[PDB]
Amino acid sequence: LHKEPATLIKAIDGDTVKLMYKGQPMTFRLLLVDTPEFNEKYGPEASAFTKKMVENAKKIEVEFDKGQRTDKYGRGLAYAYADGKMVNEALVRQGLAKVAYVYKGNNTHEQLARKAEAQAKKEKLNIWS
Ligand SMILES: Cc1cn([C@H]2C[C@H](OP(=O)(O)O)[C@@H](COP(=O)(O)O)O2)c(=O)[nH]c1=O
Numbered sequence: 001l002h003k004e005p006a007t008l009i010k011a012i013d014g015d016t017v018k019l020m021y022k023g024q025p026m027t028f029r030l031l032l033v034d035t036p037e038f039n040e041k042y043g044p045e046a047s048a049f050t051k052k053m054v055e056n057a058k059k060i061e062v063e064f065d066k067g068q069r070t071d072k073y074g075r076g077l078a079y080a081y082a083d084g085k086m087v088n089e090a091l092v093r094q095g096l097a098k099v100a101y102v103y104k105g106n107n108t109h110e111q112l113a114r115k116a117e118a119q120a121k122k123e124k125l126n127i128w129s
């Protein structure tokens, strides 16, 4: 997989963000994860976590997997990086997202995400508390 440039337009919630990609505004949904909705427990903390990561980043990148690049709602499906650190994995590591929506052929980082989830669960963090 390859990292490509993008710039932040605006934070949305724990697992969606509006980015400019190839010069066009798009909503991105983060692959392999599910954060709580803002109305749910840990939703606001997940939103804040993603917001801080993407707003503080000097460089945002997106990486598409091998399969579908947009979902049925027109959202981009990607792994997002802030100053080289994967947002998707970082949310799971912090117990702010569950590994979820693992579809075959867009699952390159599944192992990495599951290992983060195991560690978060062992530490009893947030969702796992
Ligand atoms: C993350 C992801 C979500 N989706 C779709 C499945 C779910 O459909 P439904 O809306 O029919 O439940 C939805 C969940 O996204 P959200 O968690 O943002 O609600 O997005 C994909 O199709 N591919 C993906 O990789």
Ligand SMILES: [Ca+2]
Binding pocket: 015, 034, 035, 036, 037
């Ligand atoms: Ca969600």
